[model samples]
Target: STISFITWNIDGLDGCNLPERARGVCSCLALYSPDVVFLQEVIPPYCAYLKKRAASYTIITGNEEGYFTAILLKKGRVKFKSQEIIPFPNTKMMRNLLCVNVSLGGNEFCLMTSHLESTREHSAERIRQLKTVLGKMQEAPDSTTVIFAGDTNLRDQEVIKCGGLPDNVFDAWEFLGKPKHCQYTWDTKANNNLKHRFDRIFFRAEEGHLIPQSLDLVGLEKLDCGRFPSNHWGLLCTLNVV
Candidate 1:
């Protein structure tokens, strides 16, 4: 069976919309039926709510305050391999990687996540963090895959210029050919957020080991009073792994 992956900057826990948005995110997952979901800014005390809201999967999270990342993976689909924290300097708090190892079709891969420095002034810092992140590629064998997903805080292809990924890695969005207005993950109308494709998922494998299916936005429904479900929209991608 093929695997579908989803990532979103869940905007932490808000008293106004988190309860509803949690249910809404779960609804979208039901609609897509994905095998794995990655999330950033999971600052809620304990993500048991998200787990109960998205009732079909097992939730794994960091134990630190402002834990930084979380993964929601469907049971009985992909095999869980391992989970670790990226050993990078994070003096500024919760701006690092939470790596998860999993396998499908007997091919092992790691899902690594991070929330880079936000705002334009910190673009250089973000690039530094990204470089430290991509540098971890040496730890993974060519036979393994690594998928880096998070809120990169980049505007207009900054990640490509300010920082560089491994030669074999592919940005699922650009690999799918930059379709129309499908790029923006943060829309102002939704949560008064800065509109940019800050949240992204980048994957690497042995050249032809992985295949991307579709990349699109999710979590667009508003509440009855017209408040957006979340401050930022979620991103979903489906793919086949060989």
Candidate 2:
């Protein structure tokens, strides 16, 4: 069976811009009918609004203050299991990692949605958040297939230098032999000058069966939807499960 998934960092649907971007996202879902959608920087009210618009999808919003994270899963595509609101040990505000146990095409897996600290002034805080997430994955069952996707906000070098991948965790892009063409996933229209890979999809190495047959960077220009939705381009992956 084929499983489609998309991740976008929608920086709060605001003003007259919201409806169009929301519709664009809905259109994406209609076109691909993805099994799971991971979203970052989605405000609470907007999360509610999306639920009303996309009635067929189940929504899970993080409890973190300021910009929170969300996971929208197509109903009946996966069973509703449980969720958690993870708070970094010393952080003042809540930063969450939402976990959901899901079944697709007779296969079961755990999906995690996240939005780490931005590249702004909080480098140490971001590292703490990353560690918190890794800790949770370690707590999960060994047999559980885990898929973690989000707006990591770390530059490619930082990600490589951090050495944060848990023993069993593997970056999806790297598993595909580090495809050359699919490098950057953010700030698509930076005067055609600045570019960086700020988003990622990671899964456990043991769950290799869940790896996608192909990884795609859904470029903003190709979408022709304009830049209203988000600054970051979306990522799509096609997974084959027996």
Candidate 3:
């Protein structure tokens, strides 16, 4: 059996109207119906509205930062057991790690997510935050699956180097030979002419035991009269856990 997971950095809806953006997001997410959903930089109202219709899933919010990180677990498939917040060193804004322990059909796994400090100037700080979470993830039991997904806000080399994961832990995309078409998550031609793959879904499990069946970068389609879900793309990965 397998479970599907989705991770997205909503960009706080670009400070737009929550009700309007929430509706766009609602329609966008309805396609996959993922088992576990992890989101970062979301407002309280948007998070609350997501739960209203997601009766089959439980939503958990992280409060260590100004912009909260939210996590959702399916009603029957995933059993949310415990949670702990990983406070990052340095900075008073947008610096917190959200960790939750859950079980899928009796199989235990830890789901963690965070939105690192933005901008090229804060790349070093972002690495520190990434290392903090990666070290914590490495401490999980070998039998347990570990998912570290979020908007890294750093380059591939920086993230992979700072990650310092064992052979058992690897990026879902790299482990699967880095799929095509769904690479870049952040692309904006207006303010900054930049396109990069800053968002990711990393998996930790026994070698070759946990596999990514498929990965997608979503929310590109225009919905609700040209209003999109967010400035950044969303990641949906289906993993076969053994």
Candidate 4:
């Protein structure tokens, strides 16, 4: 049996009005029926609200402050072994990378959900946080498959040139031979020229057991009213895990 996973930034479930965005997110989940969901910038009360919807769904929230990373896993399908919410190196306001050990069939893997710092003075801080998380993964047992997904906030060029992943990390889209098709994920309501592929999913290439089969960015225009569920688009990928 194959399981699908979806990851999106959602920009503070407040962008499209929390209630409406929540509905849209739920609708998307129903449509995709992903076994696991990773959400970034998910605020507090909303996180609690989402957790109560169904007994099958379990959530892991970032530090208690605010606007943190979250993961919702289907019960009985995936077992959580452990989790960690590491704070960024030099900030009171935290950025999170959640490491969860999950089991699907007889296979056990680690899935990390993150929301890196935005493009600002603290941008370098984001890279440092990512490095720390990657280091932790490297120390895990070599048999564990690792998948990293989130809102990277960096373009493809910057990701290749500056993003802090080690040489063994592979970008999902890039691994698919770099398919091209107006790859902008964010659009201003004004319809000006604000767009970029800021959201991303990555996995470790050294784990010969896990291989990416296909990957795509959900096109926004195909969505309702020429509007996306969030300002940024979402990513979908299919993997063959040995």
Candidate 5:
């Protein structure tokens, strides 16, 4: 069986026409039926809406107040074991890494997601956050498959500055051949005035228990409200279980 995952930044802070936008997100979720979802910019109200609408999934939040990140585990398909929140000591924004330990297809998995420090000026802090994430990925037991995804707000150069991802971890998109159609997750022309591939999915496994099979962008269609679901596009990656 294939394991599907989606990581999105839902723009929860945007209050105007929120219910409609939230519904748009839910529509996408129902359409995709991913086993796991990583969402950033999740506010209380937006989370409440998800709680009501996406009932079959278990929700875990990175923070109780302010905008934060969340991980959704599809009930029955994804077996929850435990979770933890890793703090960023110097963050001015309410950003942190939200992690979950889960089982799927009879294999243990260490899932991690985060809304890393934003803006071009915060590149230094963002690099540190990336290091933290990569360190966690490296530290996971060799028996588990590790997947990290979210709105990293990362610049390509920043990843270079951090010395690139550890050898054991592979960027999902790049591993799948970096298709031109899905190159940019944050396109100014489509959703905003700034363009970058800020949203990403990365995975690691010592013995190739999970293999990246396909990668594509989601939320490209305009909802009935004439706006996109969020400022960023979601990455929907399907992995084959070996």
Candidate 6:
């Protein structure tokens, strides 16, 4: 069977129409019905709303204070084992890696997420954060599939400066042949913002398990309140694990 996963950075900082936008995010989740969900820029009030609306998933929050990250696993499909927050020692924006170790369909998987340092000026800090994630990906046991996805806030040049992804690890979008239609996760043309592929899903899996089968963007629709669900689009991926 394949596992459906979604990584979205639901913009909670934009306070205008937040409650409605939160519901919009929830609606997207319900419509997609992913088996696992990774979210960044999550606030307490929004978290509570999700807890109330998405009752079928076990939500593990990364932090209680400020805006943080979260991981959601469908109750029946995923078996939780452990979780950890790998902190960025030099981070000034409360950014850190949130990892959830779980088993899905009898295979070990380590799911990781983070909201990396934002903006063009923080390129150095963002590159450092990327290194940390890539290092952690290599550190996972060979038998386990490691997936790290989130609002990376990365530029193409920054990835080259950080020395690019490891041999085994792959950017899901690039791995899927970089479809032109889904190329820009953040587009000024689409969402009236910058045209950059800021959100991404990267993974490392051994041999035949946990392979990426498809990729798509979500939260592209406008809510009734005349606002999109977020400033950034969500990445929905299907992992062929069987």
Best candidate according to lDDT: 6
What is the C-alpha local distance difference test score of each model? 0.74, 0.72, 0.78, 0.68, 0.88, 0.89
Which scores better on lDDT, 4 or 5?
Answer: 5
> Candidate 3, after superposition: displacement of residue 39 in Å?
0.2
**TM-score versus the correct structure, for each prediction:** 0.90, 0.86, 0.91, 0.85, 0.96, 0.97
Clashing pairs in 2: none
**Candidate 2: tens digits of C-alpha lDDT, residues 17-118:** 665666666666667677788888787666767877778888888763466788888888877677767766665445567787777667667889788877
How big is the positional error of residue 217 in model 3, measured in Å on the Cα after superposition?
Answer: 1.5
- Minimal lDDT window, size 10, model 4: 185-194
Candidates ranked by lDDT: 6, 5, 3, 1, 2, 4
The global Cα lDDT (0 to 1) of model 4 is 0.68
The alpha-carbon RMSD values of the candidates against the true structure, listed in the order shown, are: 2.2, 3.0, 2.5, 3.1, 1.4, 1.3
Better of 3 and 5 by TM-score: 5
Clashing pairs in model 6? 188-193
Error of 6 at 232 (Å): 0.6
lDDT of 4 by residue, 1-242 (tens): 45568887766745445555565666666666667778888887667657655346778877566788887787787888788766666754567678788887677778888888777566667667667767766776667777888876664356455644678777777777776642455546523212566667777735556777766555243234344556667676678766
Any idea what lDDT model 2 has?
Answer: 0.72
- Tens-digit per-residue lDDT, 1-242, candidate 1: 46788888777645566666666667777898778888877766436677676777777775457556788778887788788887557535557777888886677878777778777877677788788767775578887888877778878678668546667767888888986456888878656522688887788787666788888888877665466656778888888866
Worst 10 residues of 6 by lDDT: 186-195
**What TM-score does prediction 3 earn?**
0.91
In candidate 2, position 97 carries an lDDT of: 78
Candidate 3 backbone collisions, by pair: none
lDDT per residue (tens digit) for residues 1-242 in model 3? 88888888876736655577667666666778888888888877677788785667788888733577888898878898899988886944656888999988768989999888778777788877777877888888988898988888877467556646556668887767888767778878521311788888777887667888888887777655565677778888998866
Off by over 4 Å in 1: 189-194
- Evaluated at residue 142, the lDDT of candidate 6 is 91
